[PDB]
């Protein structure tokens, strides 16, 4: 519960995720809270890649 709360918070504050990606991680966290750690890591990686995309748009 608290771990899902923390995971929600971190995912919603990843600045470069788009809303489709955010929604997907939120739903995955609701479906399988025991996977929070892995899901959070995966979201951070997508955020990293989105940041690279923003660099290449620029």
């Amino acid at each position, epitope marked *: 519960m608290k771990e899902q709360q923390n995971a929600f918070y971190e995912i919603l504050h990843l600045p470069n995720l788009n809303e489709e990606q955010r929604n997907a991680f939120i739903q995955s966290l609701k479906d399988d809270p025991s996977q929070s750690a892995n899901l959070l890591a995966e979201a951070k990686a*997508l955020n990293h890649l989105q940041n690279e995309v923003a660099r290449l748009k620029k």
Partner: antibody
Framework: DVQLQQSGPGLVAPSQSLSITCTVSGFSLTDYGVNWVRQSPGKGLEWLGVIWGDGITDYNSALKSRLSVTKDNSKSQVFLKMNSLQSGDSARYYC???????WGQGTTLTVSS | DAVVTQESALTTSPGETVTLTCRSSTGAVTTSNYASWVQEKPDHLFTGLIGGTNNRAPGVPARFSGSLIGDKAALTITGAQTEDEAIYFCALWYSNHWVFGGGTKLTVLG
């Protein structure tokens, strides 16, 4: 004007390890990631790992226990270390930016059987 | 354990349009695979072309473009040039690692 310049010893035969330094200019390592990839003489491209702006590092899971990718944000340098080398690690090693958009010039490593 | 597959070879000629594709064994290529394309020319010289499905790297000529077509990623050269004869690799991101395709040898005849 992005530039990735590779240096370091490459192979150090006294240990059986590889050390490569990638010096980057044109962007801050605090913001953007750097990949390492290799290409063997008769194979394709193999991704080794990436170090992101915040220091998080993702590794190739088949090689992770032998790999260390680190960086110095102030020197704009990224360091690849690969240990316990075998002849199958002979390859050209490249540092690259986050979506493979800019490549270093490569470092050749040949490990004898 | 994803496998990325590309055409082994394609042949075009100057001024034609050619599309190279990049297939994922796990299903459709999507935005979150960040499909990226690199050119290898002789003496092991690599140049990035497209990153994150459809973004041209700085300095890359306008004739290169990237897209998703059906279930695959695609690199299109609209008006091929003789210097575009080269090997083209695609790379796809899978949750926590990159996987490269085997490369396509593009011949530009004439």
């Amino acid at each position: 004007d992005v530039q990735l310049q590779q240096s370091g010893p490459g192979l150090v035969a006294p240990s059986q390890s590889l050390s490569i330094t990638c010096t980057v200019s044109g962007f801050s390592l605090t913001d953007y990631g750097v990949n390492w990839v290799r290409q063997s003489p008769g194979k394709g491209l193999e991704w080794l790992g990436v170090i992101w702006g915040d220091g998080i590092t993702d590794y190739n899971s088949a090689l992770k226990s032998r790999l260390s990718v680190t960086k110095d944000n102030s020197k704009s340098q990224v360091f690849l270390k690969m240990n316990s080398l075998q002849s199958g690690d002979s390859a050209r090693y490249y540092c690259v930016t986050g979506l493979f958009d800019y490549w270093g010039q490569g470092t050749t490593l040949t490990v004898s059987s | 354990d994803a496998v990325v597959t590309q055409e082994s070879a394609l042949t075009t000629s100057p001024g034609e349009t050619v599309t190279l594709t990049c297939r994922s064994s796990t299903g459709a290529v999507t935005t979150s695979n960040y499909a990226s394309w690199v050119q290898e020319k002789p003496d092991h010289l690599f140049t990035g072309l497209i990153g994150g499905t459809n973004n041209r790297a700085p300095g890359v000529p306008a004739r290169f473009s990237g897209s998703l077509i059906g279930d695959k990623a695609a690199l299109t050269i609209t008006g091929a040039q003789t210097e575009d004869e080269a090997i083209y690799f695609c790379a796809l991101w899978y949750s926590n690692h990159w996987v490269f395709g085997g490369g396509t040898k593009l011949t530009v005849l004439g």
